[PDB]
Chains A and B, each alone.
Chain A
Amino acid sequence: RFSPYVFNGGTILAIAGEDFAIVASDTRLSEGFSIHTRDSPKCYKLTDKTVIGCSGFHGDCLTLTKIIEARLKMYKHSNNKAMTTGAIAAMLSTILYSRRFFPYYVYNIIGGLDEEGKGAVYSFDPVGSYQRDSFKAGGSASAMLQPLLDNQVGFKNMQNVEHVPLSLDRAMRLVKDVFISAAERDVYTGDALRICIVTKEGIREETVSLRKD
């Protein structure tokens, strides 16, 4: 009989820089053993300093995005200012917990700048627990991406390697290389790569192709 959930795939990556943040995702929308479209980016520009990604069940991703954009306007006409990055992360946890006994099947990562101009990444769970990290990878290929970023960004399990902070240009080629390796071994990943870069000058977008099989 009727089951209210289905899985759609997707992979979301975020990296908190020193004065930037990079949010990337693929554009493939799949179901079962089919491809619905090859053009469906998971990035969403909330403000000029905050980008969210949404994976999982796609019908909840469309609903949850429209709830957040309504409450941004409800904040602004009531408080005469836009929300911060940390205020959205505090608001979203209440929204996700509000349907505790019929949950959203959505994995969420919010990347953006703080009030000091530094990067900030907040990971989530489908019930609404969150924490601030430096980098997270969510979605279907999440297990294929966390061990590599621990090596390169976190410098874990490395001996006598100095800790230079990640520059912007070095962080770009790390993002472009992890999805090429992920598209080889994961079937829910490919067809494009939409990358959003949040700086103190606006939000830049960039698209890199992947393999189409």
Chain B
Amino acid sequence: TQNPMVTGTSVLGVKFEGGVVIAADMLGSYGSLARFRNISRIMRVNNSTMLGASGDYADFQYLKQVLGQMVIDEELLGDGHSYSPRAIHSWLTRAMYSRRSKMNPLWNTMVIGGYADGESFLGYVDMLGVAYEAPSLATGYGAYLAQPLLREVLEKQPVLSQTEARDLVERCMRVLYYRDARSYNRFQIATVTEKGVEIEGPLSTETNWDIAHMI
């Protein structure tokens, strides 16, 4: 991929006590035109791991196709083994690194959240094969905008409950609505626990415009 046609935008993610919560919006902008304003950008992998992505969307449907097959292919064995969320983060790294070495990359930036064996997991994957783990992640402009709000709380308080974490994302999703030209006031929140993967519906934000009456 040399020219991303239909692109998404920033994706957030943060650990908490016993799970990982991830949010992203529902917009398929084409340049500046917000052409596809009802799409899903979060894929529920089997029961513990969970994927959201940014960048080109046609490339995202390709990885949605390939990862969908690999999960089915292990469940048909029935040997009691599944892919850990760290294993998906390992496989996806080698897929991206091999793809840029042919100089024909996949224009994406992906966030992998997972909860297995009582342990949360939150991983980053770049287009160029740069991958790491962190207690809080943000892609796009959210690495410039929402990322300082995430790190200030986690340094002042290292662990978070579920209601604290979910409330904190809605604040950061509000701020991205004010100052990102590719944002949209309709997003969805996905959350892994030990109970499984759950995806909330098309939520919305609440804006303030009292400074408009000022000069």
Cα–Cα, bound, A2→B126 (Å): 13
Chain A residue with Cβ nearest B127: A2
Mask: chain A, 4-47; 1 = CB below 8 Å from B; 0 = not? 11101000000000000000000001010010110010000000
Chain B, range 60-107, C-beta contacts under 8 Å to A: 93, 97, 100-101, 103, 105
A159: Cβ under 8 A from any B Cβ:
no
B2: Cβ under 8 A from any A Cβ:
yes
Taking a contact as CB atoms under 8 Å apart, the answer to whether B144 and A34 are in contact is yes
Taking a contact as CB atoms under 8 Å apart, the answer to whether A29 and B132 are in contact is yes
Cα–Cα, bound, A36→B137 (Å): 8
Contacts A29-B132, A62-B93, A63-B97 hold; do A36 and B103 have CB atoms under 8 A apart?
no
A49: Cβ under 8 A from any B Cβ:
no
Taking a contact as CB atoms under 8 Å apart, the answer to whether A59 and B129 are in contact is yes
A58: Cβ under 8 A from any B Cβ:
yes
Contacts A1-B2, A2-B2, A37-B134 hold; do A62 and B129 have CB atoms under 8 A apart?
yes
B131: Cβ under 8 A from any A Cβ:
yes
B131 cross-chain contacts in A, Cβ below 8 A: 59, 62
Chain A residue with Cβ nearest B143: A34
Shortest beta-carbon distance from A24 to chain B in Å: 20
Of B97, B128, B134, B147, which contacts A6 at CB under 8 A? B128
Taking a contact as CB atoms under 8 Å apart, the answer to whether B130 and A59 are in contact is yes
B57: Cβ under 8 A from any A Cβ:
no
Chain B residue with Cβ nearest A6: B128
B124: Cβ under 8 A from any A Cβ:
yes
Taking a contact as CB atoms under 8 Å apart, the answer to whether A36 and B97 are in contact is no
Interface centre among A1, A2, A31, A40 (most CB of B within 10 A): A2
Mask: chain A, 53-71; 1 = CB below 8 Å from B; 0 = not? 0000111001100000000
Of A2, A8, A31, which contacts B105 at CB under 8 A? A2
Taking a contact as CB atoms under 8 Å apart, the answer to whether A58 and B130 are in contact is yes
Mask: chain A, 71-93; 1 = CB below 8 Å from B; 0 = not? 00000000000000000000000
A102 cross-chain contacts in B, Cβ below 8 A: 101
Shortest beta-carbon distance from B136 to chain A in Å: 10
**Which range contains the number of B residues in contact with the other chain?**
10 to 19
B134 cross-chain contacts in A, Cβ below 8 A: 36-37
Cα–Cα, bound, A52→B132 (Å): 19
Taking a contact as CB atoms under 8 Å apart, the answer to whether B130 and A6 are in contact is yes
Cα–Cα, bound, A63→B97 (Å): 8
Taking a contact as CB atoms under 8 Å apart, the answer to whether A59 and B128 are in contact is yes
B103 cross-chain contacts in A, Cβ below 8 A: 2, 4
Shortest beta-carbon distance from A67 to chain B in Å: 12
Cα–Cα, bound, A36→B136 (Å): 10
Contacts A2-B105, A4-B103, A59-B97 hold; do A37 and B129 have CB atoms under 8 A apart?
no
Taking a contact as CB atoms under 8 Å apart, the answer to whether B144 and A63 are in contact is no
Taking a contact as CB atoms under 8 Å apart, the answer to whether A8 and B128 are in contact is no
Taking a contact as CB atoms under 8 Å apart, the answer to whether A36 and B128 are in contact is no
B100 cross-chain contacts in A, Cβ below 8 A: 2, 4, 59
A2 cross-chain contacts in B, Cβ below 8 A: 2, 100, 103, 105
Interchain Cβ contacts under 8 Å between A and B, 16 examples: A2-B2, A2-B103, A4-B103, A4-B128, A6-B130, A8-B130, A34-B144, A36-B124, A36-B132, A37-B133, A37-B134, A59-B126, A59-B129, A59-B131, A63-B129, A102-B101
Nearest 3 interchain pairs by C-beta: A59-B129, A59-B130, A58-B130
